[PDB]
C-alpha cells in the first residue's frame, strides 16, 4: 500500500535553471561590438489598421431590394501615410459619422482611408437602418485590435544581416519582413510606432579559440598532409577562429555580420593572447625559423597541459554526474510509456515491469509508414493503434520539415484560443484528457457506483411500464370503481 | 483555462534523428578488410520443413474403433538432403495423394519424407472419410509457413568469428548457430536457400588512436612506473590500438577477427601517420636516444596542444546543450510520474507540484523485495500498491540477467500477435490502458452521465416490479372486470 | 491493431545501475587518512523517552467533579540522566504501580522521572476508575516506540566539521545537532544505545590533479597575466588540488576537514608524481631556470599529449552513446506529455502525434505567476488548468528553497503514512489515478456499459412509482374485491 498522505507538508522546493559553467581553457581574446535589440528594441518598424464599412439603403418591405454591406472588411494599406502617422503615433480614425444618403452618401462608401488620430478610439458597430427609400450609411471605422496583450505572437524581436546595417526584420508571417513584437500589432498599415527601440551597441571581448588550416592531400584511400609529404613549410598561413557568448559558440569571421539571434557581433580585430610571448611567435608561423628560446616553449606547454588535463577531470565528473540521473530516468518512466525500451534499443518492443527492479519485454513489433491515415484498419490519434467506431477523420498526411532538436530556430504563430489566467479552485487540469476529466471520473465511480447488482436487468430496451400503462390499469380501475357506478 | 484547439494549425514536423559529429583529433590510420553479411545478407543458410499426417480407417458407428491421427505433426530433420533441395530450391512435397488402404497404405502412413519441389505448394486439410471398413488416410503433405511476412524475428544477419572466416551465424534459439533471417523459414530443415547472400569484403582505414603499454609497480598503496623509480628505458615497446567506426569504439588487435555486430574487419597494417615525421619517430622509440631535433618537435607539440584545446571547447559546448534540455525534462515530466524526483535523488519520496514551478515531498518510502508477488498485503501491476478483488495470479519472480542499457547486444523471439497495418479511423490508441479506451470512457461519461439525481433508488436490488407483478394486478383488474362477469 | 499478449514470454531483466569508469588521466596521489561513520555507525549519540499520566480522583455522579489528566503527554527531558542509562542501555521505566490516593498520591501525579531499566517494557493505558470520593491514579509510565522498524526517519548518519573532531552531527530537525539513525529514537531524551557506531580511520591515496595560481591583471576590459606583462617569473608558487573520490570530486585544502558527506578527508601530504622526474621539477618552479635537460622534457609530453588525445575519444564515444538515447526519448514521452516539446524550445506551445514520426505545434501559451492558487478563474492540481466544481482549497503559495538538480543535499522527514510490505494480488497500482483507479474504470465500463439505450429515460427524478402507488392501485382494486364485499 503505502498512500503517502499530507499531515507534516515540507517547504516548497523549486528546481532551478541551469547556469552555464564555461572551462577555463580560453587563451585569445578578439574585440568585437556587440549590438542588441532584444531589450532595447521594444516593437516598432511599420504598422497595422483596420477598417469598417456599413453603407445601406432601407428599400423596405414592399421594396425588398436592400443589397448593403455593414461587414468586417479590414481594407489594409501599407506603408503611404505612415510618415505622418509618426507626427500623432495613434489610431487615425477617419469619419465616425453615419447616415448618409443620396448624393452626399460619401461618408460610409467613400475612400477608406485615414485621417485623423484618437486615443483609444473604437467601433459602435452601427446597424440601425431607419430610412425608407433612403440611405443609412453604418461606417464607425472600426479602431483597436492589438497584440495579445502579451508580446505580439508569431515572432519576436531579432536582427538580420544586411551587410553593413542590422535589419529589425526576421521574416516569417506578417509584417516588414515579417516581425511582429512587443504591442501594437497584428497586420499590415499604420499602427506601430516607437516604444522603446534602440540599439545598444557594446563593447566586448568574447573568448574564443584558434584553428590552423594546413591543406590535406587524398592519396589512395587517406587523407595526408600537403606540407608533410614534401617537408616543406608555410608561408603567409590563415586562421580560423571560434568565440563563445552567452549560450552560444559561433565563428568570427574577418569582416562580416554573423548573427544568429541578436547580438548580431561584426569584429574589429585587437587578437589578446596571454600564453606566452613566445608561444605566440611560435603558433603565427608555424614550421619557421624564427627566434623562439626552447627553455621557455618546453616549460609553457608544460603549464598547458596540466590544465588540459585538468579540464578533462571537470568533464568527467560533469559527464557522471549526467550518466547516472539517465539511468535512473529510464527506470521510473519505462512503467508507464510500455514503448520505452522498444525504443532506445533499436527494435520493437513492449516492456512489462513485474517487478520494481525486473521488466518483460513482449515484441510488439513494427508497421510501416507513407500512408494517409485513412486506410483498411488502423488509425493513430494519441500513440498506437486500437478500437474506435469511425467517424472519418482523414488527414492527408503531407510532407514535414527538420527540427534538428539540439540547435533550434524555430517560433511563431497562433491557432485559436483564451488564457489560463487566475483562480477560483474549480479549474483543475493536468497534461492531457486524463487530468482533464479527473473530477469527472471520480464522480463517476462514486455516484454512479460499478453496478455489481444495482442495475436490476433496466438495460434491456426503452419501455418501462410505458408510465401511462401503469397510468391506464388506474383509470380501467377507477371505473371498475365509481361500483359499475353504484350498481348502474 | 487555455485548451488551446486548432484553427491555424501549421506545417506537420520530424525530429531528425542523431547524425555523428566525430572530433577532428585522430592522427594514426591503419588498413582494414572490412566484410558484411548485413545488407548483401539477405538469408540463406540452411532450412525449414513441415508436415501433415492423416492417415484414418473409418470403423464405423458398429464398429466404433477409429484411432486415426489427423494432426498437425511437423516432423523436422535437418541437413541430409539440403543438397539436393539446393537444385531445385523450393518446397519437396511428398504424396499430395490420398486415400490409401489395406497393404498398399503406404502413402499417408508411410516415412514422411521430401521428394517433389512445387513452387507454392499448399495444404488442404484432408479429414474426409468415407471408407466403412477400410482406411482413408488423408496425408496432404502440409506446405507454406514462413518468415512473419516482414524479415524474420528471433534474430537479424551477423557474422561470428571462426579463426579465419566469418560465421553467418549468430546462435540464439531456432536454425544452424541460431539463426532466422529475411524470409524462408521458422523451424529446422530444408527451406532456406540463397536470396542475396554474400560478403562484401571492403577496404578502409579507420581512423584510431594508439596507447602505450607502460609496467606499473604496486610499492606501499601506490601505483608507481617500473621504468621511472630504475630511471630506465624500454626497449622494444608495445602498443595497443583503439579504433572508431560507425558508432562504434573498438580495439583492434594484431591479426585477429574482432567481430562485435557485422563488420569484423581483421587486420593488415600499413599504420598512416599525419603528426610529423619527427614525433613518429620520438612515440614510437619513447625514452631512447634517437636522433629527433628539438626545434621541430616543439614545434609540432604547440600545434598539437591546440588542437585538443579546440577539441574541449566543442565538447563543452555540446555538452551544455545536454545539461539544459535534460533539466528542461525533469521539470515536464515530474509531474506525471509520482516518484520522479524521489528516484534522481536516492531516497524514496513522491512530489507533488502545487505551483508550475514549485513542487512539494510527501515521503512515500521503501519495501523490500526477493518476493513472490504473493504474500500477505500488496502487489504490483504497473508501478506501485492499491487496492484490487484477488484473482490469486502469482508469477514465482525467477532470477533476472543484466541488459546495460549503455552497450547494448540484445533482440528476439515473437509471442503472439496480429499486426497493426493500415486505417480506417476506429483504431484509436496510444501506450496504454489510458489511451486503449479512451473513446469508451467518453463514452460512459456523456451518455452514462455522473449521475446526480437520476439514479433513483434503482441500486437496491434485482426486482423492479418483477415486471408481471403489475402484469398481475392488470389480470385481477381484468376479471374485476368482465363486472364480476356482468353480476354473474 | 497489434496489441502484442503474452504466449512465449522471455526471461525477467534488470536495468544495472551505472558503475563509474574514470579515466586515466591522473598522474599525482596525496596520503590521506579516510573516516567513515556510514556502515561502523549504527546510531547512537544521545536519546529518546516517552512518558504517560493516569492520575484521577473518581468523583461519582453526584460530585460530578472529575477533571483529571489520563493524557498521552511526552515529558521529554534531554541530556541528565543519560550516563546512567549508558549503564543499562534499555527502557527506564518509573512507577508502573497505578490507583494511588489521599496523601500518598505521589505515583500518578508525582515527577515524571526514570529510574528502573526494562528489556521490553510496554504501557497497559490504565483508565479504570473505582474509587468514589477517592483517587484512581492511572499511570503506567508508557514505553516504546522507536524509529519506523527500518532505519530512522529525518537524517542518516554523517559526520561535520568541528576543526579536529568529526561530529556524528548532522543537524536537520530533531536530536543532538539533530541527527536520527539505524534504531531507538523519534524524540529528545535517553533512548539511543551504542549499536555499532564507531569510525574506521583509513588510509587512501585518492587520485588527484593541480591548478596553479597566476595573478591577473584587469587592464582596458580584458584579463591579462601580472607575470607576462611584466616578463618576470614568480618565486614560491602555491597550487591547489583537486581528487576525486567515490562519486566525488571534491578541493582537498593545505590542512582542513573538508567533509561532504561521510568520509569527512583531512591531509596529510605525501604528494607521489608519476609523469617523469623531470617535469616534476620544472612544475614546481614554472619558470625558473633550474637544471632540466629538454631531451627527456620534450619526450614525456609528447607520451602525455598522446594519453589526453586518447582520453578525449573515449569521451566523445560516450557522449554520443549519450545524444542518441536522449534523443530517443523525446520521441516516445512527447506522445504522452503534451508540454514536453513546448518546454525544450523554450517558447510555450503544445503537441499533437497524428504520425509516429510528425508531430504537430499548437500554441498553448504562457500564464504569469506570483499567485495564491484563489483568483478569478483557473487552478493547478495535477499540470494544468481545467474545470471543476470548487472546493475552495487555497495553498497561499509561500516561498521556496533551490534544490540544484545536480548537486544534491536534501533528504529527511515524515508526513504520515503505512506500509507497502508483501502480497496478496489485491493491490495493484502504478504511478498515479490512473493506476490507483484501473480495476474500477474497467469494472465500470463492463458492469454499467456504455449505456446507449440501455438507460431508459431512467435520468429525469427521484420518483419511479414511488413504489407504493402501485401498491395503493393494489389495495384499491383488492377492494373493487372483496365484490364490492359480495355485492354489500
Known amino acids: 500500500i503505502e498512500v503517502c498522505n499530507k499531515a507534516q507538508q515540507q517547504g516548497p522546493y523549486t528546481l532551478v535553471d541551469y547556469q552555464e559553467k564555461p572551462l577555463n581553457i580560453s587563451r585569445i581574446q578578439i574585440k568585437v561590438v556587440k549590438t542588441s535589440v532584444a531589450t532595447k528594441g521594444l516593437n516598432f518598424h511599420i504598422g497595422y489598421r483596420?477598417?469598417?464599412?456599413?453603407?445601406?439603403?432601407?428599400?423596405?418591405?414592399?421594396?425588398?431590394?436592400?443589397?448593403?454591406?455593414?461587414?468586417?472588411?479590414?481594407?489594409?494599406?501599407?506603408?503611404?501615410?505612415?510618415?505622418?502617422?509618426?507626427?500623432?503615433?495613434?489610431?487615425?480614425?477617419?469619419?465616425?459619422?453615419?447616415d448618409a444618403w443620396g448624393s452626399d452618401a460619401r461618408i460610409c462608401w467613400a475612400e477608406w482611408k485615414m485621417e485623423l488620430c484618437h486615443?483609444?478610439?473604437?467601433?459602435?458597430?452601427?446597424?440601425?437602418?431607419?430610412?425608407?427609400?433612403?440611405?443609412?450609411?453604418?461606417?464607425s471605422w472600426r479602431c483597436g485590435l492589438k497584440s495579445t496583450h502579451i508580446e505580439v505572437r508569431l515572432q519576436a524581436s531579432g536582427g538580420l544581416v544586411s551587410m553593413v546595417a542590422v535589419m529589425p526584420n526576421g521574416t516569417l508571417i506578417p509584417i516588414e519582413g515579417t516581425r511582429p513584437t512587443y504591442w501594437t500589432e497584428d497586420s499590415f498599415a499604420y499602427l506601430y510606432d516607437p516604444?522603446?527601440?534602440?540599439?545598444?551597441?557594446?563593447?566586448?571581448?568574447?573568448?574564443?579559440?584558434?584553428?590552423?588550416?594546413?591543406?590535406?592531400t587524398?592519396?589512395?584511400?587517406?587523407?595526408?598532409?600537403?606540407?608533410?609529404?614534401?617537408?616543406?613549410?608555410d608561408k603567409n598561413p590563415q586562421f580560423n577562429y571560434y568565440c563563445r557568448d552567452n549560450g552560444y559558440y559561433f565563428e568570427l569571421p574577418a569582416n562580416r555580420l554573423v548573427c544568429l539571434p541578436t547580438s548580431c557581433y561584426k569584429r574589429e580585430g585587437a587578437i589578446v593572447n596571454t600564453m606566452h610571448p613566445d608561444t605566440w611567435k611560435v603558433s603565427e608561423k608555424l614550421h619557421s625559423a624564427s627566434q623562439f628560446d626552447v627553455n621557455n616553449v618546453v616549460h609553457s606547454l608544460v603549464y598547458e597541459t596540466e590544465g588540459l588535463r585538468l579540464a578533462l577531470s571537470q568533464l568527467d565528473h560533469r559527464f557522471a554526474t549526467?550518466?547516472?540521473?539517465?539511468?535512473?530516468?529510464?527506470?521510473?518512466?519505462?512503467?508507464?510509456?510500455?514503448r520505452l525500451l522498444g525504443t532506445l534499443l533499436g527494435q520493437d518492443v513492449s516492456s512489462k515491469f513485474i517487478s520494481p527492479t525486473k521488466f518483460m519485454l513482449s515484441p510488439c513489433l513494427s508497421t510501416p509508414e507513407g500512408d494517409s491515415n485513412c486506410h483498411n484498419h488502423s488509425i493513430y490519434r494519441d500513440g498506437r493503434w486500437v478500437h474506435?467506431?469511425?467517424?472519418?477523420?482523414?488527414?492527408?498526411?503531407?510532407?514535414?520539415?527538420?527540427?534538428?532538436?539540439?540547435?533550434?530556430?524555430?517560433?511563431?504563430?497562433?491557432?485559436?484560443?483564451?488564457?489560463?489566467?487566475?483562480?477560483?479552485?474549480?479549474?483543475?487540469?493536468?497534461?492531457?484528457?486524463?487530468?482533464?476529466?479527473?473530477?469527472?471520473?471520480?464522480?463517476?465511480?462514486?455516484?454512479?457506483?460499478?453496478?455489481?447488482?444495482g442495475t436490476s436487468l433496466e438495460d434491456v430496451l426503452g419501455y418501462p411500464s410505458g408510465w401511462i400503462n401503469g397510468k391506464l390499469q388506474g383509470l380501467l380501475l377507477n371505473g371498475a370503481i365509481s361500483w359499475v357506478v353504484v350498481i348502474g
Open 322 to 338: 549526467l550518466s547516472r540521473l539517465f539511468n535512473r530516468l529510464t527506470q521510473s518512466l519505462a512503467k508507464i510509456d510500455d
Open 388 to 453: 474506435n467506431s469511425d467517424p472519418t477523420q482523414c488527414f492527408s498526411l503531407s510532407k514535414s520539415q527538420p527540427v534538428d532538436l539540439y540547435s533550434f530556430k524555430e517560433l511563431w504563430l497562433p491557432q485559436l484560443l483564451d488564457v489560463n489566467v487566475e483562480g477560483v479552485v474549480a479549474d483543475e487540469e493536468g497534461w492531457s484528457f486524463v487530468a482533464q476529466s479527473k473530477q469527472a471520473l471520480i464522480d463517476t465511480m462514486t455516484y454512479t457506483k460499478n453496478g455489481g447488482k
Open 119 to 139: 486615443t483609444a478610439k473604437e467601433l459602435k458597430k452601427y446597424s440601425n437602418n431607419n430610412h425608407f427609400a433612403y440611405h443609412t450609411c453604418n461606417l
Open 195 to 216: 516604444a522603446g527601440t534602440e540599439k545598444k551597441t557594446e563593447s566586448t571581448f568574447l573568448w574564443c579559440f584558434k584553428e590552423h588550416i594546413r591543406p590535406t
Open 218 to 233: 587524398e592519396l589512395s584511400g587517406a587523407v595526408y598532409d600537403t606540407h608533410y609529404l614534401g617537408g616543406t613549410y
Open 50 to 98: 483596420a477598417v469598417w464599412r456599413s453603407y445601406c439603403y432601407n428599400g423596405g418591405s414592399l421594396d425588398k431590394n436592400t443589397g448593403c454591406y455593414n461587414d468586417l472588411i479590414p481594407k489594409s494599406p501599407t506603408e503611404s501615410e505612415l510618415r505622418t502617422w509618426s507626427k500623432s503615433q495613434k489610431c487615425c480614425t477617419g469619419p465616425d459619422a453615419v
